[PDB]
């Protein structure tokens, strides 16, 4: 990974490769669905608080639209999969919470959504498409939260 | 580079461009997102158990060249030589050169022969993701099974 | 607040909004125009004929869990007692706590047994309009039939 | 019910919720209606006369369009069950008059619709969608009539 | 005005306003564009072979009003006598009045019985174009059959 | 029927009913139409010669568009029906060709299509709708031929 | 002009305009890319085995007048002639005149008797394309077999 | 054939008829498509080598929406079946490709794309309509390639 600590990759971009474990310690790899679904990366800060139990809470409440045969949904996160785990059955969270735990928030460097001063990933999101390449990206400030339906939007034009 | 260490299923099949017996170019990647690829190494062309295994191949190609998947044929042998075989044998697939370097993708797919310097006979179905999904390399004397082939392609379909 | 007299189909489900066993708010609301909502009542996680009960839920649970309709089991117990008997008994439905004010929702659907602090074996299905449609509470010794929750929840739909 | 007198309710409100005897005496409760159709109320002023025994008569002549699977209709008036029943068995109407009857124009008044002067109600007609909100609001007056057909524009847009 | 020369098939169908048991009005261009009409002719309520033959529409109604068709049965009576007639009989299809004029309707349709000042058993099945298409008037003691309506119905549609 | 003349009848007036024998000497009545199909009604000139040649062999060359369904073309002449049948045998014509020949021109006349001082119907054309109403409405002046395309296009939108 | 070698599968059927019995005129060109057409010479109006071969077109017309098709029977008589026989007859299909030039068409499609100055009994199915698909001539004594042409057509269609 | 050089037929014209023999000596006729297939027509200048490699290779690459149901693609060349036969083998074309032989370039002459001083087809491209007439003609110049998706797009309104 070649870590771009805060420069979020944009549009055009080919996503960084990876092989991360979920919250139940399965290892899942991005270019694994290449050639089959477009894929949804949410990054979040950390699990049990602030903005984020607000944005996958979003990504729960309408899951079928993310996870179904054109779209997979990944989100991601410093944390090992025990906090992911138990975070995840507190929330009503099915979808796989990954662990860019050791090293410490390599995947997100790579994304350039690293905050390097906190040691968290800023609030990123990126849509992958079938061929590995970014069409959608962004990283929403402190002050705002993200909105699904904008995800949503992005990977309904990848399958139409 | 594994020699004889054969990949597993669930592994990426590795990428490789060579030339078929018309010298075309044929990449893997190229199938990606369109059609599951059958993939059989076999040692030497005009010689051992693969004339009945490729035969068998050419028996029930329809079944192999599709629009859900391709099959493709790999040997240490260059064109001209498997030229000659395909036409002689009535082989339409095409049969790729794992030439120079010598064995190159024989040996990333773990299924290469380093004392004998051919392929063993191994074979993979790698699906639109480039995933292995099936793999096997039976051992001397026991030849493969076209209809075990069919029915892995099957399961990646419909 | 009817004690144990109670609600008859055709009347409108009480509203609650009670933590389940991994201390989640679920309303009942919150399926209306959605799905239809089984509700089991009973009285004591750990004992009595309810662990044969719900067993049964669980034993047929993807009948009575999918995109037509839902189960609620409800007791008095806290999220604690409950978390802990549904890992021990394999259950993923949600066991909600009607746990302080005590017994308040198992008394608005008239199923609560004031002499002993419990509610007593009572079970309704409500339907997408929040009505009631189907009510039963068996007496003593008596067990709940699963089939027939199945069944009133199949007139539901199609 | 929370008395309004005739300041009429418009669209985004609560619609008051209401118990009340058909032509048949049967019960009909608004709420039920919730989470599956919407629901057509055409409050009117007194059975056997006036310019309603023609807006009910357009209700009638276009029934299928205000009974469906996707929607109800309820005729709303002071008068009680015995005056309803005679009225629809020689206008021919099918659909259900319900009795705002005793407490007198109680639901009327809940709804803004209701004349102190005469003790009637207005000719006001609500939609009410799956939410219990109210989507179409209008109350004729003397003078005018209504048009059915500005009623299913309003109930095909919450099927829409 | 043709008394008792019946109306043959491929005529048009006389145009008519009259009232029904509850003295709405009933006009059979109403129909034309929508359903076929069934036209039954009767002498008088309360008597005659004409009460079989109205209890066997009734027991039959579903069939004969749908959207595709509807049934209506005349006669000579005021609406008071048929309204009576209809609650004890459990007659819930329209009966028209054809009373003053006297017998007009049934004289259009040439099924007017002119000494005794009633319609003779005379039935029509009028199509979507206000056409007759099928037509009868059993002679005295012969009852109509109610199948035979139900199948020339059923051929002007599907 | 009341004589116009060739004070031609437009679009919104009740179209004159008429019973007329066709080639092979059978009762055509336009009534019989009323609720089931939109009917073309084609007047021409004289059987065997002019633009009408022309018009019916339109007619003829896109008969399907015209007898379907939903629609009905009826030809009017004044020649009797031993005239038209054998017109009809030479031009491949399949459709009814209706004899206004005694009276003479009666028909012609209460629709406003009929030359007085030659005493043949003027090429005019009408589309009357299943309420009996004319909704299209053209007579064509010498010089100029009638184009079928705009007739069908009449006929599709009382289908539309 | 090829007099009597019978054009073969494969060619283009040559155009032609001619008049049918009731003087119009029909042209081959004209079915071009809507139906396929049968042709089917025949010498001599009023007489020969053709009279029970045009009977047998005549007794399964339907079968050849379609959406997908049309039957043209063809011979050196003129209109006259053709109207006549086809009145007496029962045919309703074309019957066409390569009257003036004599046999003309006959000779283009190579079925022309230059001795006896008629069309020798040969018949063709031209599809879509104006290819000729179909091609016989049977010899003196026997009769072409009107199951054989329809099964000729319906090849070319579904 | 009447020879135009390089005066290239436009659309609107006729498509000179022709039988020519494929890479696999089968005769190939022009005319056989009429009332059945809309039909492109690729000329190209010699085998092995320059640009048309290149835009066979794009025929090749979306062959089934050139060799369809409704469409039929030839391409064709100076060159003699043999030659072409070794070609097509070591590129995959299994489309025909049409030997203007003997006599030299008379089919290219007649479409007007042929280039009298080298004495090889210029790159000329049209579509033939089931009519027979040219309803989309082009012919590049040096230093341009075609592109096959204007090929598609002409042949999609024969279809539309």
Not at 2 to 30: C, E, I, K, W, Y
Not at 68 to 93: C, E, R, Y
Request: aromatic share 10%; glycine share 8%; proline share 6%.
């Amino acid at each position: 990974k070649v870590p771009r600590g805060s420069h979020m990759l944009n549009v055009g971009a080919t996503a960084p490769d990876f092989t991360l474990r979920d919250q139940n310690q399965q290892l899942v790899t991005l270019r694994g669905y290449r050639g089959a679904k477009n894929v949804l990366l949410v990054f979040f800060p950390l699990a049990f608080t602030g903005i984020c139990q607000g944005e996958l809470d979003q990504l729960r409440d309408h899951l079928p639209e993310f996870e179904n045969d054109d779209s997979a949904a990944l989100a991601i996160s410093v944390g090992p999969p025990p906090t992911h785990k138990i975070w995840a059955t507190q929330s009503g969270f099915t979808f796989p919470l990954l662990s860019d735990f050791w090293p410490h928030g390599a995947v997100s460097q790579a994304y350039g959504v690293f905050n390097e001063q906190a040691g968290i990933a800023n609030r990123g999101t990126f849509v992958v498409d079938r061929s590995g390449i970014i069409r959608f990206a962004e990283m929403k400030q402190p002050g705002e939260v993200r909105d699904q339906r904008l995800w949503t939007d992005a990977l309904a034009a990848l399958t139409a």
